[PDB]
Amino acid sequence: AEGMWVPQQLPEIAGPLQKAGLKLSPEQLANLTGDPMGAVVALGGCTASFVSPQGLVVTNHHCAYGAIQLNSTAQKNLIKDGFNAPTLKDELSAGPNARVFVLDQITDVTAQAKAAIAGAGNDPLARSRALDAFDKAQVAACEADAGFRCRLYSFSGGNTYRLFRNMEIKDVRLVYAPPGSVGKFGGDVDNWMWPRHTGDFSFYRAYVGKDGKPAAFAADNVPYQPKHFLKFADQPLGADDFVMVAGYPGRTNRYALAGEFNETASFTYPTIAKHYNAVLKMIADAGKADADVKVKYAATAASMNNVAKNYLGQLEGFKRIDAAGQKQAEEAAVLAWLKKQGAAGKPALAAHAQLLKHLDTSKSTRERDLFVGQFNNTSAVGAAITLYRLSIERSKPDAEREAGYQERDLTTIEGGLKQMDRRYVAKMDQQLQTYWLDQYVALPAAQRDNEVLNKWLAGSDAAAVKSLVNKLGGTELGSLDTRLKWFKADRAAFEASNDPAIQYAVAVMPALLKQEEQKKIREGESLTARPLYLQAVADYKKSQGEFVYPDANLSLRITFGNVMGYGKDGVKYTPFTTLEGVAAKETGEDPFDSPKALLDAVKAKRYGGLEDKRLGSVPVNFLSNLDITGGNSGSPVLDANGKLVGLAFDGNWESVSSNWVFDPVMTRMIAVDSRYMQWIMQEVAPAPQLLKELNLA
Amino acid sequence: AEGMWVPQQLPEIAGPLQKAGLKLSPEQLANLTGDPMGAVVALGGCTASFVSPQGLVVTNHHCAYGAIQLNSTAQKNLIKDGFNAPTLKDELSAGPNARVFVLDQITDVTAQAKAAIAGAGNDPLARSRALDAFDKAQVAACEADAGFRCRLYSFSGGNTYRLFRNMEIKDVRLVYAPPGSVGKFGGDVDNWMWPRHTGDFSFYRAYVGKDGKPAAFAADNVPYQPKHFLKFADQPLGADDFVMVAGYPGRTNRYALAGEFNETASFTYPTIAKHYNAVLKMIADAGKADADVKVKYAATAASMNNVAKNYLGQLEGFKRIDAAGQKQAEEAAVLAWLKKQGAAGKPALAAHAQLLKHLDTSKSTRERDLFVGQFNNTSAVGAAITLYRLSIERSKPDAEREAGYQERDLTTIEGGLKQMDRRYVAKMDQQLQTYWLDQYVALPAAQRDNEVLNKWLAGSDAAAVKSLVNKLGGTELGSLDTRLKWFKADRAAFEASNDPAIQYAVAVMPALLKQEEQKKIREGESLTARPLYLQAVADYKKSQGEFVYPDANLSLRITFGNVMGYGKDGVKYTPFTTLEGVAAKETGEDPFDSPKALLDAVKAKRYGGLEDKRLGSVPVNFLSNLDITGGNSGSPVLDANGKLVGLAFDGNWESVSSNWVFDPVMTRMIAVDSRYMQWIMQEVAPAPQLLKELNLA
Ligand SMILES: N[C@@H](Cc1ccc(O)cc1)C(=O)N[C@@H](Cc1ccc(O)cc1)C(=O)O
Numbered sequence A, B: 001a002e003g004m005w006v007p008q009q010l011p012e013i014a015g016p017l018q019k020a021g022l023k024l025s026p027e028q029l030a031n032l033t034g035d036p037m038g039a040v041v042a043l044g045g046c047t048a049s050f051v052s053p054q055g056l057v058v059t060n061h062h063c064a065y066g067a068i069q070l071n072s073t074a075q076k077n078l079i080k081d082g083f084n085a086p087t088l089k090d091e092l093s094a095g096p097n098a099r100v101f102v103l104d105q106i107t108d109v110t111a112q113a114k115a116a117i118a119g120a121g122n123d124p125l126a127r128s129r130a131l132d133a134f135d136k137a138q139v140a141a142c143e144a145d146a147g148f149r150c151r152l153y154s155f156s157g158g159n160t161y162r163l164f165r166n167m168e169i170k171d172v173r174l175v176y177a178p179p180g181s182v183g184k185f186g187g188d189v190d191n192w193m194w195p196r197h198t199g200d201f202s203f204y205r206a207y208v209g210k211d212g213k214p215a216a217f218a219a220d221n222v223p224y225q226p227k228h229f230l231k232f233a234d235q236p237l238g239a240d241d242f243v244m245v246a247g248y249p250g251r252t253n254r255y256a257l258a259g260e261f262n263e264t265a266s267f268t269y270p271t272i273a274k275h276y277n278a279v280l281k282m283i284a285d286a287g288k289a290d291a292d293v294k295v296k297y298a299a300t301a302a303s304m305n306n307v308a309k310n311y312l313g314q315l316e317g318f319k320r321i322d323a324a325g326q327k328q329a330e331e332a333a334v335l336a337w338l339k340k341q342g343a344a345g346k347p348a349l350a351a352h353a354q355l356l357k358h359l360d361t362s363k364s365t366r367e368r369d370l371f372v373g374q375f376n377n378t379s380a381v382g383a384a385i386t387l388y389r390l391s392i393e394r395s396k397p398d399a400e401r402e403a404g405y406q407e408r409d410l411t412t413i414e415g416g417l418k419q420m421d422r423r424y425v426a427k428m429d430q431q432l433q434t435y436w437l438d439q440y441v442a443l444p445a446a447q448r449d450n451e452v453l454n455k456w457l458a459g460s461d462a463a464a465v466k467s468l469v470n471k472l473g474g475t476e477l478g479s480l481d482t483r484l485k486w487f488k489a490d491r492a493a494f495e496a497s498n499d500p501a502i503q504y505a506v507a508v509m510p511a512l513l514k515q516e517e518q519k520k521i522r523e524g525e526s527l528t529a530r531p532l533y534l535q536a537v538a539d540y541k542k543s544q545g546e547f548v549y550p551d552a553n554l555s556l557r558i559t560f561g562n563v564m565g566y567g568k569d570g571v572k573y574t575p576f577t578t579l580e581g582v583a584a585k586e587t588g589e590d591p592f593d594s595p596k597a598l599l600d601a602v603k604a605k606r607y608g609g610l611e612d613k614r615l616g617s618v619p620v621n622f623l624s625n626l627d628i629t630g631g632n633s634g635s636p637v638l639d640a641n642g643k644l645v646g647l648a649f650d651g652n653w654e655s656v657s658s659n660w661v662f663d664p665v666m667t668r669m670i671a672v673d674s675r676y677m678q679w680i681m682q683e684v685a686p687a688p689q690l691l692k693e694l695n696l697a
């Protein structure tokens, strides 16, 4: 079924859910801290779920990837080898910034947020500051009890605001990863593709202090005891079976204006794909010369591959469905429908006029901003900017500090500085600086008008770039101890440094703060017009019998439908893959280099009691017509009885343009079957202690 | 069904044909000069069929591509625009070397063949010379009547010989080609692929003189009047329907020795694919710079692309079915079975030992022979060699002239010199000479032992090559009128020439003639051993209840089966594509740039009365489990009643490895539906004159 339904829309999907084959009362799903919805957790960018009373958490391999990478070295490469913790004390910290978010409460604060905004009258900076102060005050009250972290969400272009309260678990440990040739079988070749044969799962365990409250890693921390956990399905999942997903999809753009879509299609997606593909080649070459570079940059390479291939898919998808035509036609239809209301339609038409005027004056600056932005987000330079910014914010009262730099953010900033140790190699960072400066100096003179960067380059050729990278080469910010000393330092200490990366951050900061202020003014201008125009689009869609649900915004959503394939002329994709398909893709070379134990078990048809007689093999991956996007990876796929039949992990090639224009015919979720997860843990990369804890052995 | 069945095996397949749904009696197909088999003609490398009483011939667009290319210029490009001849007088010569072969007679000459070989005694060179003499004598006799071309065919390793006698139509004219965007929709991307959306058809007409006998092109030649021609099918072709194909498969290797397969898999295919891919990039680059190069090298590019991609497909298919294992297992099974047969086994066991002995004599020279062979077959150099060779053979009695250099071959030699005019640009031929010379000079010293080439290079680097290419640029042989003079010149004129290409030819010729004698020796050593060992394999296969049929050898074969798709894990390929499938592949960029009229027609569901209600559209291509290979392109696909339902044109990706090891599961023929052919000539690239001639309007 189309739609990323908020839990508050359960009454509107209760009937469809039952019709599709849900056997739980839709009432049971409305208890968000209950069984089974209370078992679903946010990771921040990924979804997961509790699968044992001792705080065992299951998610995708690609979601645990960052944690696996932090614990990997060139000599002991857990990305390649996998990992298993036979006992609690074998579990590895997933890193200081790893989180498990357990939902505690949702509060609607729409009326209070709208009053905060209205209070600022016609002043857009005051409007931005008023919402910022409201967000901060809601969060501060909601976080007064230790161990909770709150987040304010804006829905439907600012027509609804809800405050979420989570128990914020901060000691997350790696329990189990399959080898990378299972976790990521087919690599970047099969990414965004069906047929799919990827064992995309891994396990964490949540921990808390001995006092029961969230704590950073400590030896005497103990496993979290969740109120609710999911059970692996005992009923074999088949074609046509009801499935549902709860999770945390990040962002969709289905309510974007036509001009927002056209800028993304014509500029953002092709441009990022081009540059990312070039940076990836540079990282791959560096990784061949030094495995330490390969391991340190593996999480960056995986993320950039995934984005660059996604963007290529979206561009092909837009042609497949004529997204530009569809956007143009719907936008024209909304304006005509508003014009038909006369008086009552004028405010939405005015709001549209206002939004339309924001949609440009980027043609001259967008390449500069991309290149300078990327340069500034290289490791040493970005650490310097973050560290200098923090020293500025610390001089203010906490409530006046920039979101991201408040007291509640300090342990996250520090964690970032710590994680950089496992994700930084000076010689690779120098190549990244050189790449992005090269693109900058190639811009026409009118466009290379970053005064500070022009001062530091003193030239616009390869020699000028080499001289600046050579100068920044002298930074001490590669040192974790130096970064942690700068974390505590005052503004004057930064301003006195002869560290070249620090000096660069000090020089660029005034211009960064002004560009940030202009951003907040532009945001404040939209806080009025965006909700009006998006409410009119939603009212129009409702008049056309179209499904009305908010764009994804990182909050909890429910999607549902059934196990089913899809088709193109001459081809029907079947809803399941099987063990034999994994072996048929074997090449003996990454990324089609399955573990020997897998090839041996498939050749022997060692099905481990998990064969689905309807397929004649153990299923591997399955297709369904659910509506998921980035953020949904690791979401539990539940059957009619609320049991875990798999994890969401990807979409097929034709699904990715549904970020902008939903296509029910060719949009499918790709999930890993819970039977494949068990079969891997039985026959290939054994986790006998996990199978015991999951009640599967 | 498996098998490329010779017409003499019709008794064996009589029952299977009936089981599969043939409504004609098998005896009707036994009549080779009768209806429908007498409608089936050879083009020499492609199949075709008569489709009107006025010698209208239908074949694939890729079979007619050479003819279309010959009639194309950068200004008037018939590959791109397509072609239609509204009247007999608008039809264009397909070129001097275009032919239609109409089967006159087949006679078995096995006994005489084997006697001729036995009679030479034991000298390998004598056995070869004796078979050559018998071939020439049987051909000379059979071709004494003015309008006939005959060919001796060796089957099943020399266990059977048959002489084919053909009426040789020497005036073939192009009547109709659709635009290249229909004829070759999807180009090299969709080549060897299902799903397929390619309208791969074109029409010729066969002309004779007013006396009713074959003539070269003349303005007062008239259409041939065939005794039999196929009728387009009136029954709509559906999934599971019986289909059959008669045609002229070139070469299969299913009876190859395990070592012949291992050399092909390990060296021949990967090496040719690598170098052809490199040359194709060069021709693409040169064609982009020069529209005259693009058109002149179109047919060469098309052919090299087809081989390179075929070879990459074969290598993948060998890995899919473990071809290396199957060859090893069969060979070992034959030898073990022969050792159980007592006295009966000893001649075949001894034959095997003789064959095994004369395999690997190449690992040393194979790279050199490939690169020098390719260099020698560049246009100017290859013309120089052929022309000097003819001048040498002319001075011999006809009967002692090398096959291909005899009286009966003169017209074909002269045709090639003329056709070169439309397929040569000096700067492109220089880049081809440079490419292949560059591969030669890269070889280790020990392997670079071509005496003449080393002398002409005077070096072993890019500069040496550039020096020799500069030298050869001096040639006159780029001029058609110069080539045709040399065609009639005697040996002494060649040996007197200071034209650097003639001088190169004169210089290599002694070493070429020795290499050719060593070839005939190697063929002579094999002429008794090969039949003995291949008869044992065939006897062993019969013992195991496997299908026994000869490897393709350019002679007429029958294959049959049913319209059916195929599958692999997660995917089922359906047996038909449809019009909407063509439109869905549209990018407006070559090779997915359909004619505006096709897109308009599809968008408007102008099905021109050709809808199949079971598909809900007009079918485009279809799949069937027939057994075809190179040479079968243009073959008519006949339904249960012997009516034309389409043309064979391709195989799916997994089919190509069946050249070496047949796989019934994933081997399919790809055919263009007779209704798509009608639909294009009605709604897109109109041919109202042909639609009437075919009785479809
Ligand atoms: N494409 C995946 C990431 C991935 C990469 C390589 C693998 O072998 C496996 C997974 C991805 O981005 N998944 C998203 C979820 C998602 C996004 C869009 C659509 O259509 C479906 C799923 C994620 O949250 O990581």
Ligand SMILES: N[C@@H](Cc1ccc(O)cc1)C(=O)N[C@@H](Cc1ccc(O)cc1)C(=O)O
Pocket: B045, B046, B062, B183, B184, B185, B186, B187, B188, B190, B191, B192, B198, B200, B306, B628, B629, B630, B631, B632, B633, B634, B649, B650, B651, B652, B655, B656, B669, B670
């Ligand atoms: N691959 C085709 C040629 C072709 C190339 C590009 C197109 O768009 C269409 C056709 C080809 O080589 N066809 C063969 C016939 C054939 C060979 C092997 C198998 O397995 C099936 C058919 C030909 O005779 O030209």
